[PDB]
A paper describes a structure:
In both MtVAO615 and MtVAO713 the cofactor FAD is covalently tethered to the protein by covalent linkages.
The crystal structure of MtVAO615 with amino acid residues 27–574 was solved in two different space groups. The groove shaped substrate binding pocket of MtVAO615 is solvent accessible and contains, besides His157 and Cys222 which tether the FAD, Tyr159, Thr221, His237, Thr341, Tyr352, Leu399, cis-Pro401, Ala402, cis-Pro403, Ala408, Phe410, Thr413, Tyr449, Asp451, Leu475 Ala477, Ala479, Glu519. On the other hand, despite having a bicovalently bound FAD cofactor, access to the active site of MtVAO615 is rather narrow.
Author numbering: 27 to 574
Write the structure that this text describes.
């Protein structure tokens, strides 16, 4: 059995879709890609100047793009079907985009869409922001549950349970980083969220784990979830906590989005705000030569433990001849910032390097975040659609023998132009209180999460971009894996073609994750590439989803 596609005898009629729309109170949207304004047909609405506006920031994570119902940010998944950078005469086609989008207002819209889809054998897709690097928030011929507009927030002053007492926030499924930060800040709190401000904090970010510059202080985003409000495949409106539907709670808190249930909201721990120490710390090989530069990168890595165990973090960009780091030091006044940086600066001084060091103390976390990752509120985060990753164990770094292999990996990757420079985050998320969840164990032993990320080139041919896609999956990622035994790959930052996904994403947790999948979705209504239980479905040459 296969899901239906447009053209099939069993594709729902115009009356069937109109019936669904009536049930949804007019909230069904026939998908019109945002870049239809760049083409004359089949939508008649070529607007040359509106098209130039889309070109200007198409490869950036913009609120304008995220606001579009049927769109996705990945240039690879757009796949030239309806894009700004082909000729106006080339027809705008849906390709990987869903055929219809449900503008979800609450639980009933989801229940009605699920029931319709099971009745008519339509593929369900779930999309929040369209950030997903693996194409998991789009799909050909699908009915998409668009969660973007569930923006409600609610401060809970005294959340009270065995697992947590303190302030919390209930956030709707569509709440993005910038909105969560604005809400948390308004009450003098912080929340654990991603570095890219348009990222959907309640969607794939937290559901897949979600690292943060506050992770050394408060753990992974998944660690901070108190409750998940969901709709199951069979339409049940449930709440999953550590003591209620707790197997579902466990799976949702790190098991990856788009497979266990449809999330309507989450409730997450808030944390007391206060001053935040910051710095730019940068150095290069210009005075001292490339070999010493790499020895300095290696020693920088080996000095991180004490810094990270104090609740602090570095997010840094590793280039072939220079490194630029951004330090986050919660509650560190100026004297304390200098004391925390001193070992790093003493080491660089002993190798002949004069670094660029620009410390600061921000009054609150919101200001700190947007000093380095702004401008507020939306940032300017570039979308690199060949994103790979590795969670690297501390033990690899602290043993200078295995750390030499790590440095050799970084040097090798630094020599590949499309994937260089690249960002790394650093964290210690062991030994903190959290409810039991399905985060890969590698997170706990982990110290670095590095994301070599290939850019898209609109002047290249489709075959060249396909070849880069394949290179990332079958050459670069396995090279990263072999250099970092004991690590894992972060399921949110990987290539859709990566063959070893099951082992690297889920490891020993897969058995239990799969039992939760089969319990809450026995008919496999939910599918995402590399998702738990995704092996039930296969995509054929046409993009049709068929049972394996
Ligand atoms: C684009 C981008 C992504 C980033 C950036 N920075 C990050 C960082 O500093 N740390 C991180 O840990 N991650 C970073 N990410 C990655 C994002 O965390 C992931 O790409 C998330 O998977 C994206 O989440 P979301 O914003 O929800 O994007 P979608 O593509 O809409 O969905 C992803 C995935 O999750 C499922 N899903 C979303 N919402 C739901 C609900 N309500 N219910 C069920 N399932 C849901 C989707 O089906 C899909 O599979 C920096 C940048 C620039
Ligand atoms: C972009 O579209 C092309 C087809 O126009 C897709 O090519 C298919 O790729 C798969 C492997 O992923 C092959 O096994 C199929 O034979 C190809 N199909 C055809 C018809 O050539 C390609 O997958 C699309 N890219 C993305 C990222 O969706
Ligand atoms: C659903 O109904 C609304 C309100 O009349 C309409 O604007 C919209 O175009 C309809 N959607 C579809 C897919 O027909
Ligand atoms: C989605 O629904 C909300 C609330 O009903 C509405 O404000 C918004 O304009 C809708 N979006 C689109 C694109 O129709």
């Amino acid at each position: 059995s296969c899901r239906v596609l447009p053209g099939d005898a069993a594709w729902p009629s115009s009356r069937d879709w109109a019936k669904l729309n009536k049930t949804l109170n007019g909230h069904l949207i026939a998908t019109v890609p945002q870049a239809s304004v760049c083409h004359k047909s089949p939508f008649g609405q070529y607007d040359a100047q509106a098209c130039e506006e889309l070109k200007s920031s198409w490869d950036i994570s913009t609120i304008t793009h995220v606001n579009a119902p049927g769109d996705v940010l990945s240039q690879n998944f757009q796949n030239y079907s309806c894009v700004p950078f082909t000729d106006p005469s080339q027809p705008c086609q849906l390709g990987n985009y869903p055929s219809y989008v449900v503008n979800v207002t609450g639980a009933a819209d989801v229940q009605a869409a699920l029931k319709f889809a099971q009745k008519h054998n339509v593929r369900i897709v779930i999309k929040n922001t369209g950030h997903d690097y693996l194409g998991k928030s789009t799909g050909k011929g699908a009915l998409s549950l668009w969660m973007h507009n569930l923006k409600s927030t609610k401060f809970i002053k005294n959340y009270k349970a065995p697992y947590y007492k303190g302030p919390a926030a209930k956030l709707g499924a569509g709440v993005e980083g910038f909105e969560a930060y604005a809400m948390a800040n308004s009450t003098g709190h912080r929340i654990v969220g991603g570095t890219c401000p348009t990222v959907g904090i309640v969607g794939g970010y937290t559901q897949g784990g979600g690292h943060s510059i506050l992770s050394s202080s408060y753990g992974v985003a998944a660690d901070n979830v108190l409750e998940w409000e969901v709709v199951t495949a069979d339409g049940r409106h449930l709440v999953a906590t550590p003591t209620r539907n707790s197997d579902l709670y466990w799976a949702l808190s790190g098991g990856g989005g788009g497979t266990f249930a449809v999330v309507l909201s989450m409730t997450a721990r808030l944390h007391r705000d206060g001053i935040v120490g910051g710095t730019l710390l940068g150095f290069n090989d210009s005075a001292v030569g490339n070999e010493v530069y790499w020895e300095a990168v290696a020693a920088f890595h080996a000095l991180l433990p004490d810094f990270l165990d104090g609740g602090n973090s570095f997010t840094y960009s590793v280039g072939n001849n220079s490194l630029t780091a951004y330090g986050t030091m919660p509650g560190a006044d100026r004297d304390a910032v200098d004391r925390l940086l001193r070992p790093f600066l003493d080491d660089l001084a002993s190798r002949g390097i004069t670094p660029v060091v620009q410390p600061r103390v921000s009054t609150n976390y919101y200001d700190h975040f947007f000093t380095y990752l702004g401008p507020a509120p939306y940032g300017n985060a570039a979308y690199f659609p060949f994103t790979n990753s590795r969670i690297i164990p501390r033990s690899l770094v602290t043993d200078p023998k295995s750390n030499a292999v790590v440095t050799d990996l970084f040097r090798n990757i630094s020599q590949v132009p499309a994937f260089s420079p690249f960002y790394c985050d650093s964290f210690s998320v062991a030994d903190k209180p959290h409810p039991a969840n399905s985060l890969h164990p590698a997170w706990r032993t982990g110290m670095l999460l590095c994301a070599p990320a290939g850019s898209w080139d609109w002047d290249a041919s489709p075959e060249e971009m396909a070849a880069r896609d394949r290179y990332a999956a079958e050459t670069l990622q396995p090279m990263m894996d072999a250099a970092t035994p004991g690590g894992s790959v972060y399921l949110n930052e990987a290539n859709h073609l990566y063959a070893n996904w099951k082992e690297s994403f889920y490891g020993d947790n897969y058995a239990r994750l799969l039992r939760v999948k089969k319990k809450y979705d026995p008919d496999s209504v939910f599918y995402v590439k590399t998702g738990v239980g995704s092996e039930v479905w296969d995509v054929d040459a046409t993009g049709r989803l068929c049972r394996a």
